[PDB]
Design a protein around this nucleic acid. Sequence first.
RNA 1: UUGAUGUCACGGAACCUUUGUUGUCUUCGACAUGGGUA
Lengths: 1480, 63
Amino acid sequence: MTTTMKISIEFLEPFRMTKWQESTRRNKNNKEFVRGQAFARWHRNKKDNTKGRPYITGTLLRSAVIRSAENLLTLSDGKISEKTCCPGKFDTEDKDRLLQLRQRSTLRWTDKNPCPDNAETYCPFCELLGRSFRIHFGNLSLPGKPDFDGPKAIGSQRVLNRVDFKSGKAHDFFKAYEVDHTRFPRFEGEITIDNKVSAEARKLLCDSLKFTDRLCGALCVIRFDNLAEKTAEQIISILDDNKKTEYTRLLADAIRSLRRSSKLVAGLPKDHDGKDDHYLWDIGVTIRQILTTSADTKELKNAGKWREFCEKLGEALYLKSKDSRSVSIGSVLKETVVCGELVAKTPFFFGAIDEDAKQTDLQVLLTPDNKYRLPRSAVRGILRRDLQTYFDSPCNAELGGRPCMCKTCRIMRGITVMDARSEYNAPPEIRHRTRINPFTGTVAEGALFNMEVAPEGIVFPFQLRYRGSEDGLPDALKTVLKWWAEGQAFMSGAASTGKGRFRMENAKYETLDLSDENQRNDYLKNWGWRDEKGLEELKKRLNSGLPEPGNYRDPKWHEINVSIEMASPFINGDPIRAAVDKRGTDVVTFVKYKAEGEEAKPVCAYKAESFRGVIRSAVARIHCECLLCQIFGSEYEAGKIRFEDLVFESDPEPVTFDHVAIDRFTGGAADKKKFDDSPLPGSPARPLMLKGSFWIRRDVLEDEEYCKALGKALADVNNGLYPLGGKSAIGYGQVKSLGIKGDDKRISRLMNVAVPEKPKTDAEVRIEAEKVYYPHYFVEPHKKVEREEKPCGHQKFHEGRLTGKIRCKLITKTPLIVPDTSNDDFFYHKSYAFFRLHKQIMIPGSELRGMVSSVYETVTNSCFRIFDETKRLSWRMDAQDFLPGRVGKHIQKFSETARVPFYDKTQKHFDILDEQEIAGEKPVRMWVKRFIKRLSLVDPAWKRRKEGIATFIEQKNGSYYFNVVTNNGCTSFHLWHKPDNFDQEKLEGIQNGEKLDCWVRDSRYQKAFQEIPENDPDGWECKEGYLHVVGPSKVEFSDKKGDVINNFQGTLPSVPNDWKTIRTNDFKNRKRKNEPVFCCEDDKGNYYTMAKYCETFFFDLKENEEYEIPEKARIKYKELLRVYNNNPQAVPESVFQSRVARENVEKLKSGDLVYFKHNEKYVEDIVPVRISRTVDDRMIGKRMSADLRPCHGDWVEDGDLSALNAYPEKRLLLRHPKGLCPACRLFGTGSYKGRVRFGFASLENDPEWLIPGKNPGDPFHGGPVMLSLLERPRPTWSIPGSDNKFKVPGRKFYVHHHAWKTIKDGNHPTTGKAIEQSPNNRTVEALAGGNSFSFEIAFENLKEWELGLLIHSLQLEKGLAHKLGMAKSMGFGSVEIDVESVRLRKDWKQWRNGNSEIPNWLGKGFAKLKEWFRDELDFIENLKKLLWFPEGDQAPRVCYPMLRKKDDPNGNSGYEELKDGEFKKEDRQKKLTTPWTPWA
Amino acid sequence: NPIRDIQDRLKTAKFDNKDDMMNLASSLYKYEKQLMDSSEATLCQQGLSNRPNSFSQLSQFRD
RNA sequence: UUGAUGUCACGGAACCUUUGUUGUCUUCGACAUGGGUA
Ligand SMILES: [Zn+2]
Ligand SMILES: [Zn+2]
Ligand SMILES: [Zn+2]
Ligand SMILES: [Zn+2]
């Protein structure tokens, strides 16, 4: 019998579970086990193995049933049907064997004595308890009893901490396992009941089971009736096949960023010029190809699969990169329900760290289905915190012991809230953070970390239930809910940076009275409306609104609004988005996402972290329990201020600006220093807007000292001292205003002689109207450079140093060009227009910064800031010590050579010789001849004049064939002799047997063949050797007809596509029949002239001489091949090109034929052909004094310097021992921020154009003008040799003149011929002289002499000027700067005028110069001479010479005849260092 | 400034002495720690002298 | 896979501290190329 009763549990929330423990540890002594007993257990099949499944013990259900039974008994009357139901027994003397004891107050309904321990009959409650197995609860396992690998398969562990109310920081925590309910909602079990149990007891059990509502820490309802690893290895192997190892972290970050959508792989960025050679995505098979294959794979087409694949790739790459009282209450009871929605107004961060995810430092909490979660524990903790704040009383409770009795705990022991999740499931975004060193002004060492953030706009469901004896909700709870509805709900962590502000919307409530019988029996029938259908039915019976508390306390946080005015470009860096965005730029702004439904929305903003850092730095510089700690918090205490992201009002779109670094020596662009960035546009006409707010506690607001500190800091920020964003050195992030509303004027209260003329110049230069001058010269530096070891820090405003602003005005003296390179087809032939921004003519601040820096570095004798130290120079040879040889560890040697015709119609060696031996692999047997015999039958009546006797044979077609036995029988030989008049006429009738005298001469004749010709069958050896075929390479092409081609008869022939089948057409010297020449015809070239017909043949190979090769020679040969390969002036047709340049040889190999020169032991140089280049052994950085090289430069000495990579001390090998020079101290270097900031210039009046425009109605646009060619600067002219006497001359400077008039006319400045349109030249829009511009400069912590020298470099003297823009060699862009005002700072409140100290500052600067250099100042005079502007009635003629004089109609010299004249190699440096030296 | 002391250690260093080795290791560790924790010593913007000898000695030490 | 007269664990916010910053004029004139003659 013992009829049973099946039961089940349906979990409405995730439940908690305890870990398995060893048998002996399961005792009263263990603490963790005792801390269990309320969560679910875990089973183990074998003790060593972790296999098993979860289950729930029956004693816990028994305790819940008992508790509910007591609750119902005290509630109704203690009368189940008609019986007394005594209070029961819960005490015994034997407390030693039990495992737990009751610590709560037992409940009471009657005052009668409990029933006897042994009696006839027991009450229904005592039957339920037992004490006689009348009722036996069973364990609950699962449906079907499956098995799992371990606890981690079904759930994940989590950490739960406890905070201190006084401070807001945790001090202890505990762990637990959480299991989702969507996967394991159902459990089953059974209950055994005896037949002697009373029907009243059965009804009580039924009611109690229906009343139980929470088990295992969750709501419950009781009822009774592969490619990732492969692709990772492929990409890693590819990067290792290259040497791109520094980029591993960046690539992993970009891959994890790509997880959002597979379509981003298609729209990946490429490299400039539209070619797929990106420095990341085209390292290779290539990374781009691999990502495309993984993208278009079918199985990875799925969104979630794609996401998981990208995350695993990122993890793998990051890993590689790192590698008993019995008290009554009463029968009154009500159950109040509240429902609503919790919307997120800002991002939020619920911390939850996973052990198997190391890439991100801070992670958010998610469900197994990637949905966002709002944990019950966090909601309960925030409710407790708000209640404690309301009562203004911390709870000094402790774990264990009796229950507490404070008001907060009493209110909290009636509360139930539901865990929630959202429908939005897109991946979270990522944010990066840094730490700044206050001394240098740059980031600290290794201070980088990541943060995961959830988006804003997500909506959660909310439900709260209160069970108490009051009429309704407590006043404290009403006030807290009103605060939450207002928007004072700060729930998530990282509140200082502006995370976790929620609002409660659509609130409804209803009250239920569980004292009334019908209502109670309706509640029990419906299970309390916990399931979804019951919840909907209850929602059909809810009233809107919320109550109104009586004692309403105002909130603790107050909102402060912010508005900022910005009239310059703005940027907030984000390298990853730049690494994946399709724009293709180096730096991009910050953009966040707003969650609307199931789709995001990009929006640009300014980071709250950055704003907080800026304000904190401003506060800390003009002033543990210090003020900064008290206001902004620290590691031991929470803060009292909370910032937020600032957004722009009318959404801008970004633009692009290009930059380039200029070399100080050559005056051209420095290699690998071309970059660009993408800021948001801003200007004075249409400035940017920023909106936002920040929160602050009232206690801080009611503190005069804290309000004073904040007011001072905000006043300093308002007075342009602290810009926002990055790249402030070039005029970005210049704040114009800052507003503060909503503080009752507590913080906002605190925020509220003409210049002398320049001195005239004493510099004088003599100009003659007949001579011609050069367009640039050099300035020789001084020997001594002053360096200071300790620069000035940025940590405070030092005393004795000045800070303020400088305002200037710029004037144009010659036409100026400053192009806008965004569009190169404004008018193939490229075209550009003047720089503009929001339709306003402007000049960027970087140009002016570079221009002023170039003169400051010259005035204060400093280092060459920009300089290509690692460049290597090369020179052409001119038509001795180079010997033949063959390559390896040593090089072989040959003793002699000889020539072999290959391109004449006499030899035909192609028909015979094999391809391998032509290439030089196999030996060849050839026939060398050393000297030739040259008869003259009659006595000279020559230089050597030998004697003999001739023996005539015959006379052929002209000529004379005959044997000649010279020296009277000593030597004999045959030959052919032509008729020589005055000697040949003696013998015109031949005899065939007549003998005559003869005198012989010898001439050097070194040739070789394989078959002896018909003419000379005598005196021919046969020796072994190799061949050196290089193909036709001697060619002399030009624009039009020269001189040799002019004498050609008839149309020249066609071109062969192969390099073997060429032959001569016509000799240059027709009379002597020598100097063969070849010509051919192509479509547009039309002019090729090849003058080579012999090849080279080595012989006399030796075995003894062997010479080791050095690595220096090796690298020199590598540079030689690179120079051959990269040649813009190369001949078009490859047949007329040497082998090394045609086959595109890259590295040296064994068995090749090359010339060389040697010392006693080693080899020094190697070349491929006879006349070749010579490569300098030393780099260009070693050809100058060590004190003039950059302070923080590059490695020039012999050494890879890669062994010391990834170590701290490597950086000390790239810095000067003596510190920093004045230029690097003022303008800053790579590890030191500067102390000057330049600003954008703006045109004041209306523009004046050089050429009138086509439309008279459009005065804001000008016409075009065509310039001549612009080619690269050449160091070889200034350094014309490899000898050690040659050094770097100095800094290049261009002179002022009026050559632009001829270009405006349309003629070439040199020749006067019309300019030819072509793809090479350019067309530009230029402004005329007389225009004016205005800009501003800001400095900070400067000395008197530094400020004076800066003012001098700005406004030097009258009669001098600067050079700005492009086409400086043609006379464009002469400008003059004059100072207008000089403000200064004394304190945060007072800003005086400093116009009456410029003479003192200038005098101190000159005194410092005198006390650095004892009155020599030669470079000063040279610089003043070069900056001299010609006055009226003086028109110098300045231009470059032509290549030859025949191309110059003026009759002036050219480069070829100038090299062999005034500008020879010995005086070129002296003539170039002297300013204004004529050359014609 | 640990840079001067490191220079003194290097120019006087010889690798057969464990005393010299531990002294140089201590100096390098002292410099590293000062680099990690921000201080006034980070304003020293100089480097070492005798670059070839210093490079040889540092490469020999860290290997 | 639990014992039985005693379980406030809905008895405990993974919380608190750190500026993607520093340094760079969209600038510009001297060649290239290997032999040929006796
Ligand atoms: Zn009893
Ligand atoms: Zn308490
Ligand atoms: Zn402090
Ligand atoms: Zn310097």
